[PDB]
Amino acid sequence: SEAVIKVISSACKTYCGKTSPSKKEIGAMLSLLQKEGLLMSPSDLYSPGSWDPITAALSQRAMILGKSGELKTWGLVLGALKAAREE
């Protein structure tokens, strides 16, 4: 995607600051969400209810395969979006 990623970058850096995820991480993780059939479009990230299955799926593959690559990026984006949705 293009716009969706930029929207996240300007948002996460407002909460996490310098501890925010890199654009390269977001862009790569987004494709993972689609390939896994978790989300149809990157814009689906605006749905807070859909965060539950995604987070669960990520933690599952992380504890089973031993890879938290997408989990690390998701955790940051999730936290930023969660805080934003709380306001």
Ligand X SMILES: O=P(O)(O)O[C@H]1[C@H](OP(=O)(O)O)[C@@H](OP(=O)(O)O)[C@H](OP(=O)(O)O)[C@@H](OP(=O)(O)O)[C@H]1OP(=O)(O)O
Among 6, 67, 82, 85, binds ligand X (CB under 6 A): 6
List the structure tokens of 11: 């948002």
* DSSP helix/strand/coil, 36: coil
In the complex, minimum distance from the CB of residue 42 to ligand X, in angstroms, rounded to a whole number: 13
Find the binder of ligand X among 14, 19, 22, 41 (CB under 6 A): 22
Q: Is 85 in the site for ligand X (CB under 6 A)?
A: no
- CB burial string 44-74: b at 16+ within 10 A, e below: ebeeeeebeebeebbeebbeeeeeeebbebb
Residue 9 binds ligand X, judged by CB under 6 A: yes
User: How far is 22 from 60, CA to CA, in rounded Å?
Assistant: 23
Closest to ligand X by CB, 22 vs 60, is 22
- Residues in contact with ligand X by CB under 6 A are 5-6, 9, 22-24
